[PDB]
Amino acid sequence: DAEFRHDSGYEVHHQKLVFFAEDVGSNKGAIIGLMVGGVVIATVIVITLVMPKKK
């Protein structure tokens, strides 16, 4: 039993982008730190997809 419990997608897992973060960030704060970083790095890429079609 592990499939009906309310936290099944956290109790049971396999591949996820945060497991690169777990590699560089020493600790939880830095591991989410880095994932919030990732959203800032991916948001800048999305801005620059848009300015060459708009300008």
Give the residue ranges of the annotated binding site for Cu(2+): 6, 10, 13-14
CA distance 50 to 43: 11
Separation CA 37–CA 20 (nearest Å): 13
What are the tokens at 2?
């592990």
Question: What are the Cα distances from residue 31, in Å, to 7, 15, 25, 37, 52?
Answer: 20, 16, 5, 10, 33
C-alpha span between 55 and 48 (Å, rounded): 11
Rounded to an integer, what distance in angstroms lies between the CA atom of residue 31 and that of residue 25?
A: 5
Q: What token pair was written down for 54?
A: 């708009």
Numbered residues of the known binding site: 6, 10, 13-14
Structural determination approach: NMR
* Binding positions for Zn(2+): 6, 10, 13-14
Locate 48 and state its tokens. 């620059």
